[PDB]
Every structure is written in C-alpha cells, then in structure tokens.
Design a protein around this ligand. Structure first.
Ligand SMILES: CN(C)CCNC(=O)c1ccc(F)cc1
Ligand SMILES: CN(C)CCNC(=O)c1ccc(F)cc1
Lengths: 237, 300
C-alpha cells in the first residue's frame, strides 16, 4: 500500500517507478479587483514526474490556457495531472512503463487510478514521506522553462545532473531531498549557499553547480545547518 | 390464501415469515403457516436454537406450486420441498387446519409493509441470482458469497448479483474519466438501466432483494450490493424524476423496517451521509432523510 521509512530502499531497486507530485500544477496569484473584491490569476504550472533511480524527470508544463472557461480548478488540476501521467505512460515503450506510481498527495490516488484502468498491473501508491518536491520551482532552470512556455510542453531533465557517475541513487536522492527541503524552508538562504562561490558554476546541461565531492559535503552541511537554523527561528529553540 | 405445511418440528427453531417471527420448541406439534397472501413473493427463514450460526431460508411464490417444509436429520436443516401430487397436498393441509396445528400469517389490514418492501421482487427474476434450476423456490443463507465477492469460492452456491464497480472500465468511458467518475449518470442510465437491467423496475427489485437478504440473513455481500445500488443512483446528476420519487419510498420502508438494534452493522455511515448530504440527490430523498434523522441521528 503506502510508502514510508520502513520500505525506503524499494525506491532504488530495479522495478521501474515514478513519483508524481501535483503541487505546482495549478498556480495562482491572488489580487484585489477595482471594486475591491478578490480575484485569482493563474500562471503556468508543471507536473513533477520523477524516476528516483535514474533521476529522469518528465516535466510537463501546464499552460494557463488549460484552465480557460473551466470550473472547480483545484479538483480539475488533479484529473488533468492524471490524464497527463496516463498519456506519458502510454507514450513509453512497454519495457519502459512504470510498475508503480507513487503520488505525493492522497487526493491524486482516485484520479490516477481511474485514468490508468487500462493498466491493471501498475500499482498506484501513496506515501507517508513528506517529500519536498513543491520546491522544484525554486530550481531556476525549471522555473524558467515553465514561466516562458507559451503552449503545453513536455521538457525532460535529469534532476541528478551527472551525480550517478560518482554516487548511488540512494545518496543522490538524499542529496536532492536535502537541497529541496532547504529551498522550501528558506529559498533566499539556500540559493545564497548554492552560488556563494562564483568559481563553481552550473554547466549549461545541468541544474545544480559542479561541486567536487568535498565541496558537496560542505554544501550538504550548510543546508542541514539552515534547516536547523530555520527550525530554530520558527520554533524559538 | 395459501399454506406451507411442515411435516414436523424436531429441533427448536426461531422461524421467520416475511417481517414476522415466532418460536417453535423441540418436537412441539407444529405443522406450518396458513393464510399466506397470494400475489407476493415470500421468504420463510430459520435460526436454530442450539447453533445460532447459519440463518438460512427459502424465497418462494405460492402460485408456482405446493411447497412444504421437512427437517432433514442428515443435513441438519429445515428443507423446502415441492409436492407434485395435488390431492395429497390438499388433504394434508386440510387435516392440519382442522386440528389447528398451523399459525396464521399475521396480516394487519392497514399494513402495506411487505408489499412496499417487495414491490419488484418476483420469483423467476430471483431465480436469475440464486441458481438452482431444479427447484421453484430459492435457498439463501448468512454465508453465501456473491459473484463479485468471488472475484476478490464455490460458484454453484453463489448470489449472482449485478456487478457494480465504480473504478472499472464498465463504469468509466475512455476520455470521460473525471466526468463519469464524479457523475455516474452514464453508468446508471446507459450501462445499467438501458443495458444490463432493461428498466428501473428490475434495478429496484434487485436492490429490494439485496436489502432483504442482508436484513433477514445477515448476508454481508447482499448488504454491499444494497449499498452499491443506492450509491450509484445518489451519485448520478441525471436520474428520472420518477425513479427518485420511488427510491425515496423504497428506502423509507426499508429504514422503517430495519431492527433498531441491527443498524450499526446493516447501515454504512459513509454511503448514507454522502447520499443524504453530499451527493447530487441530497435534496431528493425527503422521506428517507426524515426517517433516518429521527430514528438513527447517531449514524449521521
Ligand atoms: C415474536 N413476535 C414479535 C411475535 C409474533 N409472534 C407470533 O407468535 C407469530 C408471528 C407470526 C406468525 F405467523 C405466528 C405467530
Ligand atoms: C438482468 N439481470 C439478469 C438481472 C437484473 N436483476 C433483476 O432483474 C432482478 C433481480 C432480483 C429481483 F427481485 C428482481 C429483479
């Protein structure tokens, strides 16, 4: 059924799987109207579909036009996400289709399960983990491609850059979750940490900087410090 | 008015006849039930004194034959049988009626309760679920599973109810996933009413039959089947005005008849609250909602 700390190494075995995160699919800014009422304006979003073993990210850009003339958008967003995931699966060769799809929010279980009825052997699962995928839009290159998009569009990334050349997927996923958690708790500070040293750059074909092994330790330490810092600032400890 | 004589009553048993029940003692001189209304299906049912395990009974219609009950001491239960010899049967009944060894079907004249609970339950339609073609009456008990339960194990002893499953290709049209799932009007009206059942009367009889098997035998899969059909109407935005009105009456008399003390098990909190308070028909079941609220306000 659900996914928690007790079955954590399952993410990195050789059964193909994908996390789906729908947090950034329907995104709005709230503002006052001339009559002093409130109104929302939507902005591009994205579905965050990730293979945790390979780092392969299928970033589906959700262009605001998909909401035009629609009603009950937060509920439609779940079903649009499920449609898009089910289309992706179908677009993949059989040997590439997932055996399981873990949703990061339980509200996606029925929409996805109904869209995937043609795929009875693909298990749709929830998780007990608080994964920080909502901070994906704090990755500048991902934010940039979403906000410039003028039509629906699928862009592929490897969220781990070249890291699997030197470390395992377990460690790579941990590094990713730690970076995203930090971006989610203090974006400014997290980004400050990531780019303080102008001599470490982000390769054109990467998302994160080119840190040596030792520099990643330093970075990872500073992200931990920040997550504790902000926890100390939040709760006054 | 018709009669189901008993050969004898060797073991102590609570006998039930439609919504009434009475106690027979071991080897009491009991020879059956007389004055049974013609025009309706009926159900005689049984719960033994010594092993309250296994409630079991027979659905039957007096117009389809002469039926009697005889205890089988090998299989250990009261069995319905058909008497093909008409004069023999008439002669048996008359003697027992003369000796006044038969209880009378207690029909109060103001009382339409059985009619309202069996408005669409016919004996031949009943025979399409409880498969046993060499008898005109149908046996049911507490433990019989349903076709759909056996998918999730003996087929000959199953309750072939209509398979309803909201997360199934039958229920969901390709390209209408959200539409059909949040508004089952297409599963209801095209798949089930037009297509599997033929009319709203057949849909109502199964639902009515489902409830009764749950109530009288504590058959869990019937209760699931009863809940499954209620949920499918309530969850449909488009339902003919007359089906809604009838549903409200059907349900009212079921809730009215339910033993107050068995509500905790026979009634599914999630289905009822959704049906009465969330679903499309939340304003379409005035009678049922008023009796549910005054009688079972705890469930809500
Ligand atoms: C336990 N009941 C509330 C009382 C009904 N008591 C009866 O003895 C009775 C019921 C139905 C009959 F055909 C005959 C008799
Ligand atoms: C078309 N299917 C064979 C069965 C649909 N179900 C029924 O017609 C039915 C079942 C039990 C009843 F008391 C009345 C009706």
């Amino acid at each position: 059924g659900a996914m928690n700390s007790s079955n954590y190494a399952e993410l990195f075995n050789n059964d193909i799987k994908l996390f789906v995160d729908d947090t950034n699919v329907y995104r709005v800014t709230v503002h006052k109207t001339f009559e002093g009422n409130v109104a929302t304006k939507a902005i591009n979003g994205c579905i965050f579909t990730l293979n945790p073993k390979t780092g392969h990210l299928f970033l589906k850009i959700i262009h605001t036009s998909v909401w035009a003339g629609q009603k009950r958008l937060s509920q439609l967003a779940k079903w649009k996400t499920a449609e898009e995931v089910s289309a992706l699966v179908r677009s993949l060769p059989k040997e590439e289709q997932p055996k399981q799809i873990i949703v990061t929010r339980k509200a996606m279980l029925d929409p996805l399960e109904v869209h995937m009825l043609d795929f009875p052997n693909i298990a749709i699962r929830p998780t007990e983990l608080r994964l920080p995928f909502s901070a994906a839009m704090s990755i500048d290159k991902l934010s940039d491609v979403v906000m410039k998009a003028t039509e629906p569009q699928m862009v592929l990334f490897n969220i781990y850059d070249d890291w699997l050349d030197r470390i395992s997927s377990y460690t790579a996923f941990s590094r990713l979750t730690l970076l995203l958690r930090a971006l989610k708790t203090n974006e400014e500070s997290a980004k400050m940490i990531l780019l303080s040293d102008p001599t470490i750059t982000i390769k054109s074909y990467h998302l994160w900087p080119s840190f040596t092994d030792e520099q990643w330790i330093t970075i990872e330490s500073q992200m931990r410090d920040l997550i504790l810092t902000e926890y100390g600032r939040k709760y006054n400890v | 008015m018709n009669t189901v004589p008993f050969t004898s009553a060797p073991i102590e048993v609570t006998i039930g006849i439609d919504q009434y029940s009475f106690n027979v003692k071991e080897n009491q001189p009991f020879h059956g039930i007389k004055d049974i209304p013609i025009g309706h299906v009926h159900v005689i049912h049984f719960q033994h004194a010594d092993n309250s395990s296994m409630r079991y009974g027979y659905w039957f219609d007096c117009r389809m034959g002469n039926f009697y009950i005889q205890y089988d001491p090998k299989d250990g239960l009261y069995k319905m049988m058909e008497e093909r010899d008409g004069a023999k049967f008439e002669n048996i009944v008359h003697n027992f009626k003369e000796r006044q060894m038969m209880v009378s079907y207690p029909k109060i004249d103001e009382d339409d309760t059985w009619y309202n609970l069996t408005e669409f339950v016919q004996m031949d339609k009943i025979r399409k679920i409880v498969r046993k073609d060499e008898n005109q009456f149908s046996y049911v008990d507490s433990s019989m599973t349903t076709v759909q339960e056996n998918e999730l194990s003996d087929p000959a002893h199953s309750l072939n109810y209509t398979v309803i499953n909201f997360k199934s290709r039958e229920a969901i049209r390709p390209g209408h996933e959200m539409e059909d799932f949040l508004d089952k009007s297409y599963y209801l009206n095209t798949v089930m009413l037009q297509g599997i059942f033929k009319n709203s009367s057949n849909y109502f009889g199964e639902l009515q039959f489902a409830f009764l098997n749950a109530m009288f035998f504590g058959n869990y899969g019937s209760s699931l089947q009863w809940h499954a059909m209620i949920e499918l109407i309530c969850s449909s935005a488009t339902v003919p005005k007359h089906m809604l009105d009838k549903l409200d009456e059907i349900l009212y008399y079921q809730i009215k008849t339910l033993p107050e003390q068995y509500s905790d098990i026979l009634l599914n909190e999630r289905v009822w609250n959704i049906c009465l308070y969330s679903s499309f028909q939340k304003n379409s079941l005035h009678n049922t909602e008023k009796i549910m609220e005054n009688k079972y306000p705890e469930l809500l």
